[PDB]
Each structure stands twice: as C-alpha cells, then as structure tokens.
Amino acid sequence: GLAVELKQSTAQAHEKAEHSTFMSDLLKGRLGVAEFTRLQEQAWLFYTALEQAVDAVRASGFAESLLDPALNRAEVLARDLDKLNGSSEWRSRITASPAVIDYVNRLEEIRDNVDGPALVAHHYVRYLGALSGGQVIARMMQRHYGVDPEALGFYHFEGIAKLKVYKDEYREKLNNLELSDEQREHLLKEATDAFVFNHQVFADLGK
Length: 207
Ligand code: HEM
Known about the structure:
Elements: H1 2-18, H2 21-28, H3 33-60, H4 74-85, H5 90-93, H6 98-113, H7 116-145, H8 163-176, H9 181-206
Helix pairs in contact: 1-9, 3-4, 3-6, 3-7, 6-9, 7-9
Protoporphyrin IX containing FE is lined by residues 6-7, 14, 17-18, 23, 124-125, 128-129, 132-133, 136, 195, 198.
C-alpha cells in the first residue's frame, strides 16, 4: 500500500538525512541556538511556499482530508522566530539559500499546476516527518542549548491530542487515495525529490 511504499522508497534517504553534518552536529550539541535559528528561518521560507501549494490543492478537492490545516507550520514558525531572534527584524534580513530557492521553485510549480499527487508527496515528507521525529529534535534543542519550549512551537502540533492515532490515520488516508499508475509513480518520484531538496538545504546550512 502507498504508505508503506513511500516509507520503503525513501528509507535510504531518511538515513542519509539523519547523518548530514549540519543535523548531526546540531542534534549532538556541537552547534548552538544561532544555527537552530538559521534552520528555522529557511524552514519558514519553504513551509510558507509548501502551504500555498497545500491551499491550492485542497481547494481543488484532491486529498482534502489529508490536507488538515491544523498541520500548517508557517505562522507558528514565525512566532518561534520572533522569540529566537528577539524581534521581527528577521523577515527583512533572511534570504533563501540556493537549496531553498530550488525547493521553493518546485513547490510554486506544484501550486500553480495544482499538482495533487506531487503536493501529497511533499506533504508526507514534511508533515509526517515533523509529526514522527519532531519530538526528538525539540527535546535536544531544550537539552543541549536551553531553548525555551515556547520557541519550539513548530514541533508541537497544537490542536492534536492523540498523536499516534493521528499518524496511523494519516497513513490510512494515503492508502485510500485514488491514484492511477502514472499519478502513483509521479508521487513516489516527487517524494524522493523532496528528500533531495531537504538534503541540499542541510548542506547549504553546513557551508
Ligand atoms: C531531511 C530531514 C528529515 C525528513 C525530511 C524526515 C522525514 C521523515 C518522514 C517522512 C518520516 C515518516 C516515515 C514514514 O513513517 O513513512 C520520518 C520518520 C522518522 N524520523 Fe525523520 N526526517 C528527517 C530527519 C530526521 C532526523 C534528523 C531524525 C533524528 C534521528 C529523524 C527521526 C525520525 C524517526 C525516529 C522516525 C520514525 C520512523 C517512522 O515513523 O516511520 N528524522 N521522518
């Protein structure tokens, strides 16, 4: 089924994502809140773009029940960044890394083409990933760097009580999606590309 096929086809990329030099250093306590803050800045840029694409696709009527607006991160991230940076100064300073420009450009293409199958792939990669190991990341930013849980709002999905049931139900929605063979292959290819973008984001953050 689709949920299982997405996991297996991106398993080796997810393992490569655990081990990027930036994320590895970040999670082991080698960097700092500054570096976490740079990550979240780039994440605000690509979550903002992804969420426009999600809005487009949901409005078209494709995968509507999967595209839960409580998942939206961009506003919560902006609130986290206001706290991390001390003010709203950041919205006029931050610029997209080249990795992020590529990623945003693909999400904007998916938005404008209202490409349901591609959007779902990216939604899976971003949102199921954040729901799944996000707690791990938040815990380490508190443990290693003393970040206030109030500035880790991205990792709380306010509005979700029972997370484990939410994740199981998300995978059921994936499995229940009406897809032709070309739509399924396009989705799976896209999910692989999503991990490729994310790996280059971390590479640029590392540079
Ligand atoms: C490129 C950055 C990352 C992305 C895009 C990502 C994405 C994902 C996705 C999509 C899943 C769900 C897989 C599935 O169940 O089908 C997942 C699960 C998981 N993630 Fe990540 N992840 C990333 C980084 C990390 C990091 C740095 C860790 C820390 C070790 C981590 C820990 C986990 C764990 C433990 C799971 C549990 C497996 C599962 O629920 O299937 N992830 N991630």
